[model samples]
Target: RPEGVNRPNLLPKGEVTSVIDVAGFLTPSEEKRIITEVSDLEKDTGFKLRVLAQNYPETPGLAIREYWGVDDNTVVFVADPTFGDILNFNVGAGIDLEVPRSFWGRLAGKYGNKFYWQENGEAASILNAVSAIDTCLREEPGRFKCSTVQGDFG
Candidate 1:
């Protein structure tokens, strides 16, 4: 646990399973629209979205990822780690990180962090790992794009 903090138990948490890399996909206006959608969804649903921003030391552009404030669908936590799986109707995961099970503590991990939604309840682990990665990047990367995450709320 982190020092000097009071963490509540009833918060939603998740990991960064897929980073869409919006910089590579959409135009500036389109990217802004996606972000607006995500923000609106969270407001409407009363859910929290964790954003994980990064700057590749060897790369020029920024890296941004996002995770659900709360899971879109409930999952079953399996005893066997390998048997656990994070699934979505729209995206599959690649190189997911690990995180704590709760939201408050997980958010403390860092901003722009990601979480995974294992159908078997593997969200916490992945979130923490993504946060750790974010913490390792430059604080204010130069000439880098926002690298923000966006979604349709589907």
Candidate 2:
């Protein structure tokens, strides 16, 4: 547990398990869209993606990575709505060579900037963030391409 927060046993319940919005920031349909897009990306490129949405007690990015046992081929995005709704991302070590830090930083900023003090806004933010990641991964050919990684990146 992180401070006053009681970390629940958050797991992917079904096929669409990549996006996890603990704070109910995204709607059912939005989640589905993200899932489908991410799944296709994974199918196209051997990379896994996941997102955790909550008001994290500690640093949102590092805490999720530690708790989830994230692998090198995976990318995890954390959206913390605590003090100021912000977004953080962690890419696996294997793909770190291809995707630069600036790419992730800009993506996080894109989400954080769209977020506001509203549930619908939060949902929109998540949708935009997910879409961006999916598009980026698929648009690129080889340099920043994803493969053999179970981590998420955007």
TM-scores of all candidate predictions against the true structure: 0.23, 0.70
- Candidate 1, residues 16-133: lDDT per residue as tens digits? 4223321132334543544454455345543233322212221111122112322432121111122212211111121111212232223322221223333312233333333332
Q: How many backbone clashes does candidate 2 have?
A: 8
Score each candidate by Cα lDDT.
0.27, 0.64
Best-matching candidate per lDDT = 2
Error of 1 at 151 (Å): 16
The backbone clash count of each candidate, in order, is 22, 8
The segments of candidate 1 whose C-alpha lies over 4 angstroms from its true place after superposition are 1-23, 48-154
CA error at residue 2 for candidate 2, angstroms: 3.9
Give the runs in model 2 whose Cα sits over 4 Å from its true position: 1-8, 12-16, 58-69, 83-85, 114-120, 141-154
